[PDB]
Scaffold this active site. Structure first.
Site, PDB file in Angstrom:
ATOM      1  N   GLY A  19       0.803  -1.215   0.000  1.00 19.52           N
ATOM      2  CA  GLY A  19       0.000   0.000   0.000  1.00 19.52           C
ATOM      3  C   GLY A  19       0.833   1.261   0.000  1.00 19.52           C
ATOM      4  N   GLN A  20       0.410   2.250  -0.805  1.00 18.56           N
ATOM      5  CA  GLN A  20       1.065   3.555  -0.967  1.00 18.56           C
ATOM      6  C   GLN A  20       1.224   4.305   0.367  1.00 18.56           C
ATOM      7  OE1 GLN A  20      -2.073   4.646  -3.952  1.00 18.56           O
ATOM      8  NE2 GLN A  20      -0.374   5.213  -5.297  1.00 18.56           N
ATOM      9  N   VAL A  21       2.339   5.043   0.537  1.00 22.04           N
ATOM     10  CA  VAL A  21       2.597   5.850   1.739  1.00 22.04           C
ATOM     11  C   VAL A  21       2.196   7.293   1.436  1.00 22.04           C
ATOM     12  CG1 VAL A  21       4.139   6.360   3.690  1.00 22.04           C
ATOM     13  CG2 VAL A  21       4.548   4.310   2.296  1.00 22.04           C
ATOM     14  N   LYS A  36      -0.088   4.821   5.820  1.00 21.66           N
ATOM     15  CA  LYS A  36      -0.045   3.737   4.846  1.00 21.66           C
ATOM     16  C   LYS A  36      -1.507   3.376   4.564  1.00 21.66           C
ATOM     17  CE  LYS A  36       3.299   0.102   3.890  1.00 21.66           C
ATOM     18  NZ  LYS A  36       4.222  -0.894   4.503  1.00 21.66           N
ATOM     19  N   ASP A 135      11.680  -6.211   9.624  1.00 24.00           N
ATOM     20  CA  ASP A 135      12.018  -5.617   8.332  1.00 24.00           C
ATOM     21  C   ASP A 135      13.042  -4.486   8.439  1.00 24.00           C
ATOM     22  OD1 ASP A 135      11.959  -5.521   5.502  1.00 24.00           O
ATOM     23  OD2 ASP A 135      10.089  -4.343   5.413  1.00 24.00           O
TER      24      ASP A 135
END
Ligand SMILES: Nc1ncnc2ccc(-c3cc(F)cc(NC(=O)CN4CCCC4)c3)cc12
Ligand SMILES: [Mg+2]
EC number: 2.7.11.1
Lengths: 293, 275
Positions: A19-21, A36, A135
């Protein structure tokens, strides 16, 4: 503010621009926030609720871009709703951006010492609260305009940004992955442990020194096969100090059972002994400023 | 170097289809209003140029460079034919019972194979065959997307055993027949609504694919021809897997008496799903 809930974001947060930030803001305060935004099925909403119960709680920490909460912007019945994961804003970009813009795509050793200590202090906070980041990489290590180092947190406790939107079915980039997290013949079941973050920290230190992680030139599928087989990665150049080589070797212990903890690596001479810290902090603040203009 | 700016030629409308393809947009040809798919990359064109001239491969229109201020990374735009009726993964998800009729599977699988035959005859391996890369147009035409194929490993469930490196296979041997394994998994996906090992962690599925026997359809309802087709696509050792040409002659693919009605049924399904 509630991190155990799943409210509509209206009157709490709103989006301002990409998903785009997305860049967003807290309605009542005007405080900037990275949001997000992910498309979720009306079935995935039930998966979010369960994952929200799995969340472990922890305080704010100077080395973690604070996770403010999860929200669901409801769309008309049948139409896919929107999951919003809200986190604190860091305007000076990522460490990967930092190393990319510099000449020779390499950071000064005292910059790597400073940034690596901030990563480890953020990790120590997460690990003491029984949370694994999972991550760690240069892209997920952000700088503020004040050269403060912060770890990306979009709800790392329950990995809310990696489990929904079919994203869960993707393997992702393998280069910062510890050997134990890669299922191979000798390791049929992946074993994520707090120490997997420390392997990632060592790869991030190599990435800051060279501009790219080890095996970057290889096909991700080939790198995935080589990480559990190859001896621990090493810095290519001999220019680096003996302490820096020692730090890398400390993080990159192949067997996670034999890898040091965050506390033990925080005592490593490369991390512990930073005489030019004040100047590094000034050099970074100055680098951020001249990159902006 | 002779790539022009897309302004006044193509405009981005929205992301298609909400992250699954990355930076791919539903674009619009400004002068005609005709839709197009645009692959936006931050800056392998002639691959999409000459290998997309086949009815079962989304057609390449052109390449453009949206120039950013000096120092700031430019934008490469790759424009192709828009396929408006979504993917075959969308199709099965939007069908009652998450399963397609066998004659629908036969039809879609033949179109995939004809697209693959075109790529394989030109020494191109698609490498990413899956329901999400098989698109439908409004008039139920079937088109392949994303061939070539850089640092992200996508979904593993459609990957052939030989493409997954392990102790006995240290160098993953991508062969044209790896696309045929993927086509068999796509046929299972159309039949059941999900690929085999869907309930497993992608990293676990990556370990199990080269170890597990070939996947099989769960239900016994299916025809003997359909079971035979799946067995044909899913031969574990690619050395004995049939060629695209051999699978195109398979009775499940070759013998399609209700083809005309299937096409009508698909058009009608696409229309009902839109509204
Ligand atoms: N033609 C179309 N019509 C409608 N919907 C469409 C949706 C997607 C696409 C499309 C077109 C394309 F070039 C590449 C990809 N996929 C990727 O970029 C995946 N990458 C693998 C490595 C990085 C990401 C998707 C074309 C469409
Ligand atoms: Mg074509």
């Amino acid at each position: 503010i509630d991190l155990s809930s799943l409210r509509d974001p209206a009157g709490i947060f709103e989006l301002v621009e990409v998903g785009q930030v997305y860049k967003g803001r807290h309605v009542k305060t005007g405080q900037l926030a990275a949001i997000k935004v992910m498309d979720v099925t009306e079935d995935e909403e039930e998966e979010i609720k369960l994952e929200i119960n799995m969340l472990k709680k922890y305080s704010h920490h100077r080395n973690i871009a604070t996770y403010y909460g999860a929200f669901i912007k409801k769309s008309p019945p049948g139409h896919d709703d929107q999951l919003w994961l809200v986190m604190e804003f860091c305007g000076a970009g990522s460490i990967t951006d930092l190393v990319k813009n510099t000449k020779g795509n390499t950071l000064k050793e005292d910059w790597i010492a400073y940034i690596s200590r901030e990563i480890l202090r953020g990790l120590a906070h997460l690990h003491i609260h029984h949370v694994i980041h999972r991550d760690i990489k240069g892209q997920n290590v952000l700088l503020t305009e004040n050269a403060e180092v912060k770890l990306v947190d979009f709800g790392v406790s329950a990995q809310l940004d990696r489990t929904v939107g079919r994203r869960n079915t993707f393997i992702g980039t393998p280069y910062w992955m510890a050997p134990e997290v890669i299922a191979c013949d000798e390791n049929p079941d992946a074993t994520y442990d707090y120490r997997s973050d420390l392997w990632s920290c060592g790869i991030t230190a190599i990435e800051m020194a060279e501009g790219a992680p080890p095996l970057c030139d290889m096909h991700p599928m080939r790198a995935l096969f080589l990480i559990p087989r190859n001896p621990p990665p090493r810095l290519k150049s001999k220019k680096w100090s003996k302490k820096f080589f020692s730090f890398i070797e400390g993080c990159l212990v192949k067997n996670y059972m034999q890898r040091p903890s965050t506390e033990q690596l925080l005592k490593h001479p490369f991390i512990r002994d930073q005489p030019n810290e004040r100047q590094v902090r000034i050099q970074l603040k100055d680098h951020i400023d001249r990159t902006r203009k």
